[PDB]
Amino acid sequence: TPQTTDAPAFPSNRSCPYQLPDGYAQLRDTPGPLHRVTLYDGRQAWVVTKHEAARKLLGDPRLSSNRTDDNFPATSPAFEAVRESPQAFIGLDPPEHGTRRRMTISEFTVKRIKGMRPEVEEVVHGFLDEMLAAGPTADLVSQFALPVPSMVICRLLGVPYADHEFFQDASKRLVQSTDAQSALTARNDLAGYLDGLITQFQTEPGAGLVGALVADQLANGEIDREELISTAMLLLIAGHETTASMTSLSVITLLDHPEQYAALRADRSLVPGAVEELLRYLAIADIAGGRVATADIEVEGQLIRAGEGVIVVNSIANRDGTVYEDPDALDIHRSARHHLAFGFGVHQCLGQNLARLELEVILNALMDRVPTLRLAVPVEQLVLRPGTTIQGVNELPVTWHH
């Protein structure tokens, strides 16, 4: 008996770090902006598979980001960890979203990010010093890809780096969590740590965004103590995990396209455009597109009903051939403009300027300090994270000329 389905299972896992899963490429090819899918618990939902329609729906206020809504398209049991506690502004709609987000934007401006350039370079070259002095073979993730953005975001947040082993482990346990209880345990571990950090700042006013939020908004009752915890946790995990994944996958991808890597090294003028193309191509946050319709939405003849879950899959939208000619080809020289790796609209990634800065610095540093860098194993031996979480590899064995 045939098993062809109208709503295939979603999400799907990558088999190649920089290629869509086979199922996603099928969704990309099927005409129309929408397609039905079956989530892990049997409920059906819509997935958006085209670029301009993704922009349109991301800007549509009728698609809500409220993750506490019972009809929100949860794609894994671990998603329950964020549903039970107060929502950081990633899970808020206007006007609450803007009031909370504006409490944090000062630390992510173009002026502040450019101001952080010397300390980002210092942290990058510091962890490179330690890795190269230790010699190959090293795991690029635990020795460079993860600690670099961890240290940077901690200094931005005011989180003491001396506790890094604790909250890096709690962050990883949440990222890789495959059940609800494990995710909630790792989340409460972070919540308990951040709550004590708040009390510490109330005794002794401190630096970083968390200290600012404690001294001002919390003391004026304009943010709840548990919203501060959720917001700080969002920035902490995002600061750690997204950049680390872009680093490891950019290294894997660039080494599989050695002509473009050598061209990139020969001209650092190309690093900014190469970073945009890597963001479009790798789209490591393609699971973070969930929305729920609060009213009927008709999309090019197809009707989204109120109460239906919608998932804007930015990896698929970033492979729209009508926007990026030959979209499945990595081209660091192409115009990667208007890609959706960071989203679009009111929720577009607050840390996008920081991720762009860190990746540029990291890529330039790897080409300067370790040009003989190469993988210590075939990419087929690398272990990919599933489509239910942030795209990445659990470890990246690398070697170089000692």
Ligand X SMILES: O=C(O)Cc1ccccc1Nc1c(Cl)cccc1Cl
- Residue ranges binding ligand A1L6Q (CB under 6 A): 75, 79, 238, 242, 284-285, 287-288, 290, 349, 389-390
| Shortest Å distance, C-beta 389 to ligand A1L6Q | 5
Binding ligand X (rule: CB under 6 A), the pick from 174, 210, 278, 299 is 174
**Which residues fall within 8 angstroms of residue 210, CB to CB, at 6 or more apart?**
157, 158, 159, 194, 197, 198, 201, 228, 232
- Amino acid code (one letter) for 246: M
Binding ligand HEM (rule: CB under 6 A), the pick from 56, 101, 319, 385 is 101
Residue 89 touches ligand X, criterion: CB under 6 A = no
Which residues line the annotated binding site for heme?
97, 101, 291, 347, 349
Joined tokens for residue 381 = 């031996």
C-beta of 264 vs 284, nearer to ligand A1L6Q: 284
**What does the radius of gyration of the chain's CA atoms come to, in whole angstroms?**
21
| Shortest Å distance, C-beta 294 to ligand X | 20
Phi, psi torsion values for 398, nearest 5 degrees: -125, 160
C-beta of 56 vs 187, nearer to ligand X: 187
Please give the residues from 251 up to 290 whose contact with ligand HEM meets the rule CB under 6 A.
279, 284-285, 288
Whether 390 and 237 have beta carbons less than 8 Å apart is answered as no
Whether 219 and 201 have beta carbons less than 8 Å apart is answered as no
C-beta of 73 vs 375, nearer to ligand A1L6Q: 73
Pairing of strands 138-139, 302-304: unpaired
State the DSSP code for 217.
I
Binding ligand HEM (rule: CB under 6 A), the pick from 74, 120, 146, 235 is 235
Residue 342 touches ligand HEM, criterion: CB under 6 A = yes
Residue 153 touches ligand X, criterion: CB under 6 A = no
Which residues line the annotated binding site for calciol?
75, 187, 230, 287
Q: How far apart are CA 192 and CA 124, in angstroms?
A: 30
Residue 238 touches ligand HEM, criterion: CB under 6 A = yes
Q: How far apart are the first and last CA of the chain?
A: 59
Whether 76 and 389 have beta carbons less than 8 Å apart is answered as yes
Which residues line the annotated binding site?
75, 97, 101, 187, 230, 287, 291, 347, 349
Please give the residues from 289 up to 328 whose contact with ligand HEM meets the rule CB under 6 A.
314
The candidate with the shortest Cα–Cα distance to 350, out of 105, 175, 149, is 105
Residue 156 touches ligand X, criterion: CB under 6 A = no
Whether 221 and 155 have beta carbons less than 8 Å apart is answered as no
Binding ligand X (rule: CB under 6 A), the pick from 159, 237, 278, 293 is 237
Residue 75 contact among ligand X, ligand A1L6Q, ligand HEM, none, beta carbon within 5 to 8 Å by kind: ligand A1L6Q
**Which residues fall within 8 angstroms of residue 295, CB to CB, at 6 or more apart?**
62, 306
Tell me, letter by letter, the H, E, C secondary structure of 67-110.
CCCCCCCCCCHHHHHHHCCCCCHHHCCCCHHHHHHCCCHHHHCH
C-beta of 51 vs 400, nearer to ligand HEM: 51
What track of x and - describes contact with ligand X for positions 60 through 79 (by CB under 6 A)? ------------------xx
| Shortest Å distance, C-beta 104 to ligand HEM | 7
Q: How far apart are CA 327 and CA 318, in angstroms?
A: 8
Residues that bind ligand HEM (CB under 6 A): 65, 89-90, 101, 234-235, 238-239, 242-243, 246, 279, 284-285, 288, 314, 341-343, 347, 349-351, 354-355
Binding site for ligand X (CB under 6 A): 78-79, 81-82, 88, 90, 174-175, 177, 183, 234, 237-238, 241
